[PDB]
Nucleic acid binder design. Structure first.
Ligand code: MG
Ligand code: MG
Ligand code: MG
Ligand code: MG
Ligand code: MG
Ligand code: MG
Ligand code: MG
Ligand code: MG
Ligand code: MG
Ligand code: MG
Ligand code: MG
Ligand code: MG
Ligand code: MG
Ligand code: MG
Ligand code: MG
Ligand code: MG
Ligand code: MG
Ligand code: MG
Ligand code: MG
Ligand code: MG
Ligand code: MG
Ligand code: MG
Ligand code: MG
Ligand code: MG
Ligand code: MG
Ligand code: MG
Ligand code: MG
Ligand code: MG
Ligand code: MG
Ligand code: MG
Ligand code: MG
Ligand code: MG
Ligand code: MG
Ligand code: MG
Ligand code: MG
Ligand code: MG
Ligand code: MG
Ligand code: MG
Ligand code: MG
Ligand code: MG
Ligand code: MG
Ligand code: MG
Ligand code: MG
Lengths: 55, 196, 288, 140, 95, 105, 97, 118
RNA sequence: GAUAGAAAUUUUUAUCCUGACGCUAUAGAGAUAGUACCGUAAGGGAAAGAUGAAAGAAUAAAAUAAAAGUAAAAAAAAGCAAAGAUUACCCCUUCUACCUUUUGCAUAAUGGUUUAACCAGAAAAAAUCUAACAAAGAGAACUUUAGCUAGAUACCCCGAAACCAG
RNA sequence: GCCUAACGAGCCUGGUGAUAGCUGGUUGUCCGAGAAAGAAUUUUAGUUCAACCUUAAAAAUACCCCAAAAACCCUAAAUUCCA
RNA sequence: UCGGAGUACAAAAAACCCUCCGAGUGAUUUUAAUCUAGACAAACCAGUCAAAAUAACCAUAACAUCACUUAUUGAUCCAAAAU
């Protein structure tokens, strides 16, 4: 359920996750579905990070 | 959703007879050995001229399936969205027509550049103004349909959508209802707390 | 919002003529025609398998099959008759209360949990009801009157500390089915049946104040209850002096399915009326 | 829904056009024709690789005729032309032999000279002599 | 196995499985050892122990048993007092 | 196959490229549909490219006919008298451009 | 392989005839209609096939259960045989087991 | 059984005339090999096939360069009948970064740094 | 063992809108017909049609002349019949038919005179792929420690000697 | 032996699309990888497991491998194991 | 069917209507427990070892022994026993 520039979100998500893994996380952007998809289980840390930004 | 609307209704009555249902040939047409030719059982075998069909269509067949609710809803939303974004949606008030002459309607669609075909949606079936019904009963391309008869296929078949104002107020509510709703406990036709 | 919409002004009408299924949605089927998929057509060569006759599933080719050399042992033995209690953690209960699905204000029994879709019962699978488990014990801050079919010491302890009341009640399979989906039952056109008693194995469970059993002697309740405090080291509140107390004390008859209705009545939902038997025999049967 | 092949006609023509010039029933009957056409294509590609060998052998035979005329065998001619740093493929050499008999007699003269120079140097048994045509030039 | 029944057209279960095996919800199957009640006087106490075990089946057997068994048997079960409820989830499995 | 088909020696028409070079392609005729999807590429080509092509080759006359057809064709025609038919049916703008070039040269 | 020498009469299908223009009209009857009738109700067909689907065995088996006692002798017999055949084939034959 | 094969070290003790013969310096071993695969791996045991693959020698009559360290010499020793080994020579020395584009390898086994000036 | 297999208990809203992503003369009924013909009998069981508004327009008028088979037009050293070619048809050079079956077939192992028309892969448990909604999902019944729902992906043809009933 | 031109047990119809681990057959084009047998089995004309292999997917080490190391009478080509 | 030696020379494995010996148990008292890390072996089924911890016993007391010791054995179901 991502409404907007999803590429922005991809940038911010990989910039957020990068300090964790030492490397950029692998990603898939579905622009038509309005969806982002990330390799590995980041579920908790990402709910936290999306809470911090007030969505 | 368009594919769904097309198929889910469909029942093919196409039947072919298997070598079992063909008329005769319960008996071996000649002896297994010595006659010098190919060996056969029934003369109704699928190899033979008049014989049964090897696979072929079988029985009345139903193609029936249901796209999940929220998907069909989403389909309707999207059709509306797209009719609008491409400028081909026109919210009309009323539907009162000055006269029952259909030529009036055709030339009206010519003056506003509405395209060849038009879908006129009204709120209920009985409440349709009689001038419209007269005018639109004798036309092929202009089609009058009540709100509950709005659908993806018909919306993609007609170049232009014309929605009555109470019709908009209806659809908006009907479709929006689903984003906020629980999964059904039992069928929605039964008593629910808030729901009709 | 959706910038996609702005690209749609520029492009031709969406019609029935141009419509593409999402790429990957349909993996195209393949038919045994041509050089690749023809000539033995994936069936191999001669033998039993090219002819389609290979033996049944477990069959090992004549050596005593693996699934039959292993000895029988009761594993699933009598499985159909075991009781099944759908677990509900305090974590889920709290999460439901927080979001306003079940309200703690009125009493919470099975029907309330089902209507919030916090829980799902299927009696046909021999679900005998909800059991309460302690997963969210520490985090649990809510004040509730709850009725479940089973509970753990720790769960109860965690509800008491917050000034609520737990009670374990029993429902037989028919009772249970009626309880969980009441409106489908009220269209059935039958009276409201008696609640059956528990079977002999489950009597020592519901007769104890330990479990806060619905058949338990209330004389032991305030005793056993206080015991639970000594163990977990918290001050037991006086439920009597609370404003919501009249709701917290609310029970059911051991013979009653619902709150405020009674065995033998009939709910006419079209007239929004209740119907009760005036007959003596009926009233003796339903009230026994 | 019955579906039959309507266009079978053309399906057949795309085989049969390649078969027109065959002898016998192979040039009509689709069964026989098909097999024959396939054999014809296979034979064709194999021959496409063969043709190059055939032509090169032709060229060598011709160059040998041409050389033998001048009293010079083929191998001598060719390698002693290499030892002069003259690289002309056999195609071109054969064409010279036919259409440029003069230039070819020159080439043959050169080769013969280079050979004699080689024998002279091998028999001489010293590093000092470098035959005029036995000198090896580097690119500039 | 009957893949399509005669009356219902559904797929039948092979009951001979359901008597000797146990399906945890993770997909692991659990079975008794073979010959564990047989000729005990003749065996070592060590061997006897090895026999009294409940053991797990390899992947192949598991898939075979799953095919031989309908959907109903793979459902999530909550039994009261159940010994095996402890074992039905899998933990710390990195694969 | 080579025994199968006809053959010819390598030649030029009218000793082209000896005295001077003469582009041999004479005229080019397109037929397409304003409406039909099959002709889509061919329409785009007519929009953007044809014009420029016509400047790049002054000596070839280019006739464009919109007509109701299902299969857009381009008919190349040469000084030689030779007429070569082609189908631009269901191709890109890019593909058509390359094709028209082959025809030109 | 002889192909027909005369152009067929060109068949003109107008897509604006009544049946084609009104197609798929009430399909959303459930959603827009405050669910009362499911779209199944719209389906015109054989009694055993309305709003239901299945492979040929299931189909036949179902036909027999519903209308099997209204059937003509020959047809009932044929149906039984078809069922027996399909049973044997699906259950005991195939590649995949 | 046909098996792998030991190759006694005595084979690899060079005689003093060999230096004169093949043009190696008695004092200093060369630094690099140019190895070429001269024969085919077909009809040879799988292990030689593997050794050839991991030496980069897959394609025939193509040169490849390798360190003259013992790690490498071991594998080379296994396949020595399938290959030609000649010492790399640097008349103009090793290439700088300006000379990378102009480098070429002559058949006498020598690497020329400046190729085709003007 | 192969396999077989309930029930209690549940659910089901009228009537009109009937037709066809069924066949088109080897198809669809066996069917122009249970006729001809074949059997003592029970029984078996065919094939076949095509002008036009008018033939009360047959010195008759009109659009395919395209299968195999022949004719127009017999053959000319030499060789799986072609291919490379070539000024040139041959002459030269190079190639051990095709399927099937096999460790291995030019095989002197199998099958086919040829042409036309017919004549043979079918299923959704688990999986994967796409999408919806998501701690829940499904238009009731179920399943859920990221799941649930939907869609798409799959498993042939001909043949015995027999056996049983009438 | 004979019982309507085939009687070690008639014929016809139905059961019947009997069943064949046995033979035969199995229809467009082009591309990517690609297989010779350990175990049981009224089994060796077949199956079902391994080992290989194919399609996806997650990973981290994989071959190659110098010393050192693996038996008691004699004993080869050589294995095993590893930086 | 099971085991030992050769075939099969040095890790393992390895066939034959191949070469040779055996087993389908005795005798004895030291009557040889419970539970569990990790392994061997292995298509599956079966087979093998085994630390720590308990309990038994000297009061910190767990390998039954011999006969080449290796082999002296048999799945499910089903029957008898009642623990
Ligand atoms: Mg029959
Ligand atoms: Mg019969
Ligand atoms: Mg014959
Ligand atoms: Mg038969
Ligand atoms: Mg027929
Ligand atoms: Mg194939
Ligand atoms: Mg074929
Ligand atoms: Mg075959
Ligand atoms: Mg075989
Ligand atoms: Mg449940
Ligand atoms: Mg080449
Ligand atoms: Mg059995
Ligand atoms: Mg007919
Ligand atoms: Mg007929
Ligand atoms: Mg002809
Ligand atoms: Mg010849
Ligand atoms: Mg043979
Ligand atoms: Mg083979
Ligand atoms: Mg041969
Ligand atoms: Mg022979
Ligand atoms: Mg012959
Ligand atoms: Mg032979
Ligand atoms: Mg023969
Ligand atoms: Mg032959
Ligand atoms: Mg034979
Ligand atoms: Mg054959
Ligand atoms: Mg023959
Ligand atoms: Mg599935
Ligand atoms: Mg298929
Ligand atoms: Mg497949
Ligand atoms: Mg019998
Ligand atoms: Mg029998
Ligand atoms: Mg007779
Ligand atoms: Mg058969
Ligand atoms: Mg067999
Ligand atoms: Mg044969
Ligand atoms: Mg191979
Ligand atoms: Mg046996
Ligand atoms: Mg396998
Ligand atoms: Mg070593
Ligand atoms: Mg290593
Ligand atoms: Mg191991
Ligand atoms: Mg110990």
């Amino acid at each position: 359920k991502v409404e907007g520039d999803i590429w922005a979100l991809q940038k911010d998500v990989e910039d957020f996750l990068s300090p964790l893994l030492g490397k950029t996380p692998v990603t898939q952007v579905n622009e038509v579905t309005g969806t982002l998809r990330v390799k590995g289980y980041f579920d908790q840390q990402l709910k936290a990070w999306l809470l911090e930004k007030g969505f | 959703v368009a594919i769904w609307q097309k198929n889910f209704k469909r029942i093919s009555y196409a039947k072919t007879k298997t070598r079992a249902e063909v008329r005769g040939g319960g008996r071996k047409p000649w002896v297994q050995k010595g006659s010098g030719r190919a060996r056969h059982g029934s003369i109704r075998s699928p190899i033979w001229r008049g014989g049964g069909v090897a696979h072929g269509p079988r029985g009345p067949t139903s193609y029936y399936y249901m796209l999940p609710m929220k998907v069909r809803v989403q389909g309707l939303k999207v059709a509306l969205t797209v009719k609008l974004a491409q400028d081909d949606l026109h919210i009309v008030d009323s539907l009162e027509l000055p006269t029952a002459d259909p030529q009036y309607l055709i030339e009206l669609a010519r003056y506003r550049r509405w395209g060849d075909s038009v879908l006129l949606v009204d709120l209920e079936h009985e409440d349709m103004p009689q001038n419209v019904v007269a005018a639109t009963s004798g036309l092929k391309t202009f089609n009058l349909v009540p709100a509950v008869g709005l659908n993806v296929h018909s919306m993609l078949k007609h170049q232009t959508l014309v929605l009555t104002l109470p019709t908009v107020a209806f659809l908006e509510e009907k479709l929006l209802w689903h984003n906020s709703r629980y999964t059904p406990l039992y069928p929605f036709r039964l008593p629910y707390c808030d729901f009709p | 919002g959706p910038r996609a919409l702005d690209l749609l002004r520029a492009l031709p009408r969406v019609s029935l003529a141009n419509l593409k299924p999402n790429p990957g949605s349909r993996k195209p089927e393949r038919r045994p025609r041509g050089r690749r998929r023809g000539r033995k057509c994936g069936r191999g060569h001669k033998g039993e398998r090219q002819r389609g006759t290979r033996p049944r599933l477990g069959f090992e080719g004549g050596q005593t099959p693996f699934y039959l050399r292993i000895p029988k042992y009761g594993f699933n033995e009598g499985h159909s008759f075991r009781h099944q209690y759908q677990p509900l953690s305090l974590n889920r209960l709290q999460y439901l209360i927080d979001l306003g699905r079940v309200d703690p204000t009125q009493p919470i029994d099975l029907t309330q949990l089902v209507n919030g879709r916090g829980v799902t019962i299927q009696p046909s699978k021999r679900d005998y009801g909800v059991q309460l488990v302690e997963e969210g014990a520490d985090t649990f801050k809510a004040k509730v009157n709850i009725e479940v079919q089973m509970a753990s010491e720790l769960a109860i302890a965690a509800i008491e500390k917050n000034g609520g009341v737990v009670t374990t009640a029993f429902y037989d399979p028919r009772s249970l089915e009626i309880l969980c989906k009441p409106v489908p039952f009220f269209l059935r056109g039958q009276p409201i049946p008696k609640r059956m008693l528990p079977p002999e194995a489950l009597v020592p469970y519901y007769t104890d104040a330990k479990n806060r059993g619905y058949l338990a002697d209330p004389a032991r309740f305030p005793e056993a209850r206080l015991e639970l405090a000594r163990k977990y080291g918290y001050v037991l509140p006086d439920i009597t002096k609370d404003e919501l107390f009249k709701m917290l004390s609310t029970r059911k008859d051991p013979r009653q399915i619902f709150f405020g209705l009674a065995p033998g009545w009939v709910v006419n939902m079209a007239d929004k009326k209740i119907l009760k038997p005036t007959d003596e025999n009926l009233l003796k049967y339903y009230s026994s | 829904l019955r579906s039959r092949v309507t266009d079978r006609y053309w399906r057949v023509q795309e085989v049969l056009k390649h078969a027109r010039h065959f002898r016998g029933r192979k040039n009509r009957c689709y069964r026989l024709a098909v097999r024959a056409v396939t054999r014809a294509f296979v034979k064709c590609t194999r021959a496409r690789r063969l043709k190059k060998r055939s032509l090169r052998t032709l060229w060598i035979n011709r160059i040998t005729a041409a050389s033998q005329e001048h009293g010079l065998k083929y191998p001598a001619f060719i390698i002693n032309l290499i030892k002069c740093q003259v690289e002309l493929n056999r195609k071109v050499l054969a064409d010279l032999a036919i259409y440029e008999p003069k230039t070819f007699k020159s080439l043959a003269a050169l080769a013969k000279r280079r050979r004699e120079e080689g024998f002279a140097a091998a028999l001489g048994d010293g590093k000092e002599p470098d035959g005029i045509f036995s000198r090896v030039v580097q690119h500039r | 196995v009957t893949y399509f029944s005669s009356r219902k057209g559904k797929r039948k279960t092979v009951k001979a499985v359901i008597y000797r095996f146990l399906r945890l919800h993770s997909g692991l199957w659990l079975r008794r050892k073979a010959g564990y009640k047989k000729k005990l006087w003749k065996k070592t106490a060590a061997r006897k122990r090895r026999l009294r075990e409940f053991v797990f089946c390899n992947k192949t057997q598991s898939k075979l048993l799953d095919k031989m068994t309908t959907s109903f048997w793979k459902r999530r079960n909550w039994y009261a007092d159940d010994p095996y409820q402890k074992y039905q989830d899998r933990t710390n499995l990195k694969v | 196959t080579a025994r199968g088909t006809a053959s010819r020696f390598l030649t030029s028409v009218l000793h082209n490229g000896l005295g001077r070079y003469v582009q041999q392609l004479q005229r080019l005729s397109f037929s397409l549909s304003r409406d039909a999807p099959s002709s889509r590429g061919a329409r785009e080509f007519v929009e953007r490219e044809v014009t420029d092509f016509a400047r790049r080759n002054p000596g070839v006359v280019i006739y464009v006919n919109p007509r109701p057809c299902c299969v857009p064709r381009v008919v190349a025609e040469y000084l030689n008298g030779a007429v070569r038919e082609e189908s631009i049916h269901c191709k890109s703008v890019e593909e058509i451009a390359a094709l028209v070039q082959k025809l030109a040269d | 392989f002889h192909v027909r020498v005369t152009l067929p009469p060109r068949k003109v299908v107008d897509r604006w005839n009544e049946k084609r223009a009104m197609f798929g009209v009430y399909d959303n009857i459930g959603i827009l209609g405050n669910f009362e009738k499911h779209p199944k109700e719209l389906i015109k067909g054989p009694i055993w096939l309305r709003g239901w689907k299945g492979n040929e065995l299931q189909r036949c088996i179902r036909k027999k259960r519903m209308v099997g006692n209204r059937m003509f002798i020959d047809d009932l017999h044929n149906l039984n045989k078809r069922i027996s055949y399909l049973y044997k084939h699906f259950n005991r034959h195939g590649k995949y087991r | 059984k046909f098996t792998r094969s030991r190759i006694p070290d005595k084979v690899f003790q060079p005689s003093p005339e060999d230096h004169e013969k093949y043009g190696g310096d008695p004092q200093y071993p060369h630094k690099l090999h140019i190895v070429t695969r001269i024969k085919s791996t077909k009809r040879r045991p799988y292990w030689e096939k593997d050794i050839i693959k991991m030496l980069g020698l897959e394609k025939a009559h193509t040169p490849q360069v390798h360190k003259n360290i013992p790690s490498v010499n071991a594998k080379l020793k296994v396949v020595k009948h399938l290959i030609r080994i000649k010492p790399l020579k640097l008349p103009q020395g090793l290439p700088t970064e300006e000379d990378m584009a102009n480098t070429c390898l002559k058949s006498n086994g020598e690497l020329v740094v400046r190729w085709l000036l003007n």
